[PDB]
């Protein structure tokens, strides 16, 4: 439905929707912008990610509430409603994965853009894995593969303090701990990431230092919870 709106207008409206906390609208505007077929800038990639993270975040929070109620009950209503929310969550994840596959990843030549999109691919397969049962095995492997390709590029092309590299490692560690039943891998990755970033902080400006240390704090918080 966004095909008749100018690309620049979709981006401007996504920024307005963000300020208004209208994240469903924001995601629709950014899907429209992606479908214009041009590559996205760093700012635009962030708008896309913020929009869908907030949409799926609300769905995940609701699914967790309903799944907990369903587990304690073990009429059809709780299961039916959990299934409805689950289907809507899967549809949002499928939409994001479809944008990445048609055709954001293949057109991303630079490391900053390719790593960003491969991290997103890992994240949205991870959200699918949270609700999967199989099928679950295949989804987990798709998430792992995307995160690992992103890690390989990031280690070759970005410094250890780069925020995209840090956020990738953080989310891959969460995947290992919460999805893949690999808590030792999660702890090892978070520790190595934190230590390598620490040793590179001396190279950063005051503003970059604040960006990198913000994400390092999340790695530290997880390590405290996991050990």
């Amino acid at each position: 439905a966004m095909g008749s709106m100018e690309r620049a207008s979709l981006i401007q409206k996504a920024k307005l929707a963000e300020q208004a906390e209208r994240y469903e609208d924001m995601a629709a505007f950014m899907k429209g912008a992606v479908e214009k077929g041009e590559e996205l800038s760093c700012e635009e990639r962030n708008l896309l990610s913020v929009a869908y993270k907030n949409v799926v975040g609300g769905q995940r929070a609701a699914w967790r509430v309903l799944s907990s109620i369903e587990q304690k009950s073990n009429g059809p209503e709780v299961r039916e409603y959990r299934e409805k929310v689950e289907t809507e969550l899967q549809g949002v994840c499928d939409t994001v994965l479809g944008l990445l596959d048609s055709h954001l990843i293949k057109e991303a030549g630079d490391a900053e853009s390719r790593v960003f999109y491969l991290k997103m691919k890992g994240d949205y397969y991870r959200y699918l894995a949270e609700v999967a049962t199989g099928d679950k095995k295949r989804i987990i492997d798709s998430a792992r593969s995307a995160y690992q390709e992103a890690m390989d590029i990031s280690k070759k092309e970005m410094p250890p303090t780069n925020p995209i590299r840090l956020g990738l490692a953080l989310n891959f560690s969460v995947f290992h701990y919460e999805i893949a039943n690999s808590p030792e891998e999660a702890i090892s990755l978070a520790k190595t990431t934190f230590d390598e970033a620490m040793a590179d902080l001396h190279t950063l400006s005051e503003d970059s230092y604040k960006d990198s240390t913000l994400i390092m704090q999340l790695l530290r918080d997880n390590l405290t919870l996991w050990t």
Binding site: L170, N171, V174, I215, L218, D221, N222, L225
Partner: peptide, 6 residues
């Protein structure tokens, strides 16, 4: 639950 990226 573990914290993921903001």
């Amino acid at each position: 639950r573990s914290l993921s990226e903001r």
